[PDB]
C-alpha cells in the first residue's frame, strides 16, 4: 500500500527559497508504523533529507515537527493518525524558528528564553540539611507535571505570542520551567525570581490561547503553570 508525503525542503547552498517536495513510500499494508520510521526510510531513498532524531521513544525531544498542520514528535505519531484518503501527509519545520536546513530548526531563542528564567535550584545554604534536603511527598507532588518536560519546543513554537516576541515573551516551555523552580520547596529565591518576571512581556504576553496544552507530547499544561505564576505575581506586587 502506497503512502504519499509533501515535505519541506531547504538548502541555503542550493535553494532560492524553501519548497515542498513529493515523496512516495511503499508501506507494509498490515503493520502500522511511526512517522519517524517513514522519515528514516525516505532517507535511504533520498540521502539528502535532513531531520533530527534520537531516542525514537518520545523522551528526548529531538524530532518536533509540524505534521498535518499541528506540532508533535515523529517517533510517536503513528502513520495511521496522519494518513487520509487522497491527501498527502504534510511535514514542515516547527513554526516561528529559523530554518537551518530541511526539517531542522535553529532552537537558539527557545533555549535562550529557557536560560533567562534561571532554570537551576537556588538554595542560599542556610539551615543545610544533614543529608538530602527533606521534601515531603506532599511538596514533591508539586513538581509533577512540570519536571517531565523534554524541551522539544512543540508548545512554544505553536504559540502566537512567542512568534511575535520570541525574545521578550518567555514562552510556554520557559514559563513551565520557571514555575518548576518557583514551587520547588528546596529553592529559596522565589521572591527574587518573581521580581524578574514582573515586566510587561515575560509572563503577561500569554493570552490563554491554549495551543501549548494541545500540542505537548508529554501532556503537560503550561497554561495552568502560567496561571500559577500570575497568581504569585499579584500576590506579591499588588
Amino acid at each position: 500500500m502506497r503512502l504519499e508525503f509533501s515535505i519541506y525542503r531547504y538548502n541555503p547552498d542550493v535553494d532560492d527559497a524553501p519548497r515542498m517536495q513529493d515523496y512516495t513510500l511503499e508501506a507494509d499494508e498490515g503493520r502500522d508504523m511511526m512517522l519517524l520510521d517513514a522519515l528514516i526510510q525516505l532517507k535511504e531513498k533520498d540521502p539528502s533529507l535532513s531531520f533530527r532524531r534520537s531516542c525514537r521513544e518520545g523522551v528526548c525531544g529531538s524530532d518536533g515537527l509540524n505534521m498535518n498542520g499541528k506540532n508533535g514528535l515523529a517517533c510517536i505519531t503513528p502513520i495511521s493518525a496522519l494518513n487520509q484518503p487522497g491527501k498527502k501527509i504534510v511535514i514542515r519545520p516547527l513554526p516561528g524558528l529559523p530554518v537551518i536546513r530541511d526539517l531542522v530548526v535553529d532552537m537558539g531563542q527557545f533555549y535562550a528564553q529557557y536560560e533567562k528564567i534561571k532554570p537551576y535550584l537556588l538554595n542560599n545554604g542556610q539551615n543545610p540539611p544533614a543529608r538530602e534536603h527533606l521534601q515531603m511527598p506532599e511538596q514533591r507532588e508539586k513538581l509533577d507535571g512540570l519536571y517531565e518536560c523534554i524541551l522539544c519546543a512543540c508548545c512554544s513554537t505553536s504559540c502566537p505570542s512567542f512568534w511575535w516576541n520570541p525574545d521578550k515573551f518567555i514562552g510556554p516551555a520557559g514559563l513551565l520551567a520557571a514555575y518548576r523552580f518557583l514551587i520547588d520547596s528546596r529553592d529559596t529565591e522565589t521572591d527574587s525570581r518573581l521580581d524578574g518576571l514582573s515586566d510587561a512581556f515575560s509572563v503577561f504576553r500569554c493570552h490563554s490561547i491554549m495551543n501549548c496544552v494541545s500540542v505537548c507530547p508529554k501532556g503537560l499544561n503550561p497554561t495552568r503553570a502560567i496561571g500559577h505564576i500570575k497568581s504569585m505575581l499579584l500576590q506579591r506586587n499588588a
Partner: protein, 588 residues
C-alpha cells in the same frame, strides 16, 4: 596550521551523564574546558534511563556500602576490578546526595528522604535478604538526572559546543593524545580542538545490533576513535542484554517493573523465574534472567502474537494507583509500542541489547591505559574516558541495574577531581604537527571523495544482522568464526562505501556515515573478543565452552588494535578498606 585551532585545558567529548559531571567538575577546579556533543546535551541517551541509581543511601532500610560492593562483585561474575568497585560503592552515597542538592527531583519516602526501590541483584548482609537501594524519580530517573546536570552546566557557564561531531583523536609525534578534530554539524566547518586532556565520554553502541534499547545515536564513536588511534579496548565481548525490552519494538521497560513486584510468566502461565533462580527470583542478575527467558522461548514455552516470540511480564496486580505513580513512564511506553495497557494486561517482553560492559581501559582517575610489548599497563598521555565508553572496570561481565548512572556520576566526578594531578603527572606534551592534524581527517576525506562506491545503508543492515544472529545472548564456536568472516567482508565493503550528500549545511548523511565506521570498529572488536574467550561468564555464554573457567579466564580480555590480536589483563582483587571477595560459584 591551515585549520582553525581552539585550545582548552580539557576537551570533554560527550555531554551525557558522565560527560556533564566531569565538565562541571573540571570547570569548578579552575581549568578551562570545552564540552562537545553531537546532539544537544539533553538528548543524550542518559535521558532515556528509567530505573534509578543504585547506592547505599540506607533510606528504605539500613544499608551498608560493602553489601552493595558484594552484590556488584558477584554480579560482575568476579571480573570486576574490586578496588574500583569499592571506590564506587563507598563514594556513591555522598556523590548522589550531591545531585539532590543540585535539585534533582527524586521521589520521596513519607518522612522526606529520597525514595529507593528494590532492583535486580540487591541483597542485605552479603547475599542475604532482598534489598531496596535504587534511588529514583518515578521511572524517569535518567531524564531527571540529565536535565539537572544540564541546568548545573548552565548555572556554571560551561562552554558547550552543541552539535559538533568528533571525527578522530590527534596524536603528537610522541604518541600522546593532544585533542581531536571535530565537524560542526550546522555549518560544516572542521576544527582542531587542542587540549592537554581529551576526555572521551561518548556512551554505548547498542546500535551494532538489529534490536537494541539504545538511541539511534549510540554508535560507539568512542570505540572507533580509540581503536583508530591505536588504543586497546577491553572485555568487548561483554554485552548486557536487558531481560525486558518490548517485543518487536526494542524500547525498554524498566527492571523497576520487577522491583515493584511484577514477575515473568511463560505461555503456560507459570512463573518460571522461581525455578531458574530460587532465591532472587525475578530479581536475579540480568544475564541470568535474559537466558532464562530465552530457554523458555527456545523450547516452545514462550508466547506469540503481533509482537512475535516473547515472555509475559505481569504488573496488573500492583494496581492503577501504584502503577501511575511509581512507573508512569512505562505505562506510556507500553501503550505506545506494544498497544498494551499494563494496568489490565501483561507486557510482551524479550531480552534486548542494552549496555556495553566493555570499553576503553581506565584507572579510577579516568586516565586511559594501554599495554607495552611486555604486557604491562602504561597510561596513554592526554587521553581519558568516563561513563559507558569506559571499562574501569566496575561491571566485569554483568552490570547491576542502577549501577550505570552511579558510575557516570562517581567516575565523571573523579576524572575531574583528579585532572589537575593527572596533567602534572603526564608532563607537558609536545605539539601536534600539521600533518598530525591532517591524519585525523583521513577518514572524513575518504567519504567526501567517494561518490561511486557502495551503499552504506546495505552495509549497516548486514552488519547488525551479523551481530544479532552470531553474537546474541547464546554463542557458539562455529557461529562466531563465521560471523567474524562476514565482518571482514562487510568491513571491506565499507572502505569503498559512498557519501551521497555532498552538502555542508546540516548534512546528516555525512554524520551517519562517519558513525557507520564506528559501528564497524566496535562490532569487529566485539567479535574478535567473543571468539577469543573460551568459557562462559556473566553475559558471555558459549555452548561449546559452557563452564566458567577461573583457572584461565579470571581476567580481562584486551583487543590490540594494531596487530588485531587478543591478550589478557589482570582483574584487581585488592580493595583498600575490606578484604577481597574470593571468586566462588555464582547462582541466584
Amino acid at each position: 596550521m591551515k585549520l582553525p585551532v581552539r585550545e582548552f585545558d580539557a576537551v570533554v567529548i560527550g555531554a551525557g551523564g558522565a560527560g556533564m559531571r566531569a565538565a562541571l567538575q573540571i570547570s569548578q577546579s579552575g581549568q578551562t574546558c570545552a564540552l562537545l556533543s553531537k546532539v544537544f546535551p539533553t538528548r543524550s541517551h542518559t535521558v532515556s534511563a528509567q530505573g534509578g541509581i543504585t547506592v547505599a543511601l540506607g533510606n528504605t532500610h539500613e544499608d551498608n556500602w560493602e553489601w552493595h560492593m558484594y552484590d556488584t562483585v558477584k554480579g560482575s561474575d568476579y571480573i570486576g576490578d574490586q578496588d574500583a568497585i569499592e571506590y564506587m560503592c563507598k563514594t556513591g552515597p555522598e556523590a548522589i546526595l550531591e545531585l539532590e542538592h543540585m535539585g534533582l527531583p527524586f521521589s520521596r519516602l513519607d518522612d522526606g528522604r529520597i525514595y529507593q526501590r528494590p532492583f535486580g541483584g540487591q541483597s542485605k548482609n552479603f547475599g542475604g535478604e532482598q534489598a531496596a537501594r535504587t534511588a529514583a524519580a518515578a521511572d524517569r530517573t535518567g531524564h531527571a538526572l540529565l536535565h539537572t546536570l544540564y541546568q548545573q552546566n548552565l548555572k556554571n557557564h560551561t562552554t558547550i559546543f552543541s552539535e559538533w561531531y568528533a571525527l578522530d583523536l590527534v596524536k603528537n609525534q610522541d604518541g600522546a593524545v593532544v585533542g581531536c578534530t571535530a565537524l560542526c554539524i550546522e555549518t560544516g566547518e572542521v576544527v582542531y580542538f587542542k587540549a592537554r586532556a581529551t576526555v572521551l565520554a561518548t556512551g554505548g553502541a547498542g546500535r551494532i545490533y538489529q534490536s537494541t534499547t539504545n538511541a539511534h545515536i549510540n554508535t560507539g564513536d568512542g570505540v572507533g576513535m580509540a581503536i583508530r588511534a591505536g588504543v586497546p579496548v577491553q572485555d568487548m565481548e561483554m554485552w548486557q542484554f536487558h531481560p525486558t525490552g518490548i517485543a518487536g519494538a526494542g524500547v525498554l521497560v524498566t527492571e523497576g517493573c520487577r522491583g515493584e513486584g511484577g514477575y515473568l510468566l511463560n505461555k503456560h502461565g507459570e512463573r518460571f523465574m522461581e525455578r531458574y533462580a530460587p532465591n532472587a527470583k525475578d530479581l536475579a542478575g540480568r544475564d541470568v534472567v535474559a537466558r532464562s527467558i530465552m530457554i523458555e522461548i527456545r523450547e516452545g514455552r514462550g508466547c506469540d502474537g503481533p509482537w512475535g516470540p516473547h515472555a509475559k511480564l505481569k504488573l496488573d496486580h500492583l494496581g492503577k494507583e501504584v502503577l501511575e505513580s511509581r512507573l508512569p513512564g512505562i505505562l506510556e511506553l507500553s501503550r505506545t509500542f506494544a498497544h498494551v495497557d499494563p494496568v489490565k494486561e501483561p507486557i510482551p517482553v524479550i531480552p534486548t541489547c542494552h549496555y556495553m560492559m566493555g570499553g576503553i581501559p581506565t584507572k579510577v582517575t579516568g586516565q586511559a591505559l594501554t599495554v607495552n610489548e611486555k604486557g604491562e599497563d602504561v597510561v596513554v598521555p592526554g587521553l581519558f574516558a568516563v561513563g559507558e565508553i569506559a571499562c574501569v572496570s566496575v561491571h566485569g561481565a554483568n552490570r547491576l541495574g542502577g549501577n550505570s548512572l552511579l558510575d557516570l556520576v562517581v567516575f565523571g566526578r573523579a576524572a575531574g577531581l583528579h585532572l589537575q594531578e593527572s596533567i602534572a603527572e603526564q608532563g607537558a606534551l609536545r605539539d601536534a604537527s600539521e600533518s598530525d592534524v591532517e591524519a585525523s581527517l583521513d577518514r572524513l576525506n575518504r567519504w567526501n571523495n567517494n561518490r561511486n562506491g557502495e551503499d552504506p545503508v546495505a552495509i549497516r543492515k548486514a552488519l547488525q544482522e551479523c551481530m544479532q544472529h552470531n553474537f546474541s545472548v547464546f554463542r557458539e564456536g562455529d557461529a562466531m568464526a563465521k560471523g567474524l568472516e562476514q565482518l571482514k567482508v562487510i568491513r571491506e565493503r565499507l572502505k569503498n562505501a559512498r557519501l551521497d550528500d555532498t552538502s555542508s549545511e546540516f548534512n546528516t548523511q555525512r554524520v551517519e556515515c562517519l558513525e557507520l565506521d564506528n559501528l564497524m570498529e566496535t562490532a569487529y572488536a566485539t567479535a574478535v573478543s567473543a571468539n577469543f574467550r573460551t568459557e562462559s561468564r556473566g553475559a558471555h555464554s558459549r555452548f561449546d565452552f559452557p563452564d566458567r573457567d577461573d583457572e584461565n579466564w579470571l581476567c580481562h580480555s584486551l583487543y590490540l588494535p594494531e596487530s588485531e590480536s587478543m591478550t589478557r589483563r589482570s582483574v584487581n582483587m585488592e580493595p583498600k578498606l575490606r578484604p577481597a571477595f574470593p571468586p566462588k560459584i555464582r547462582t541466584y
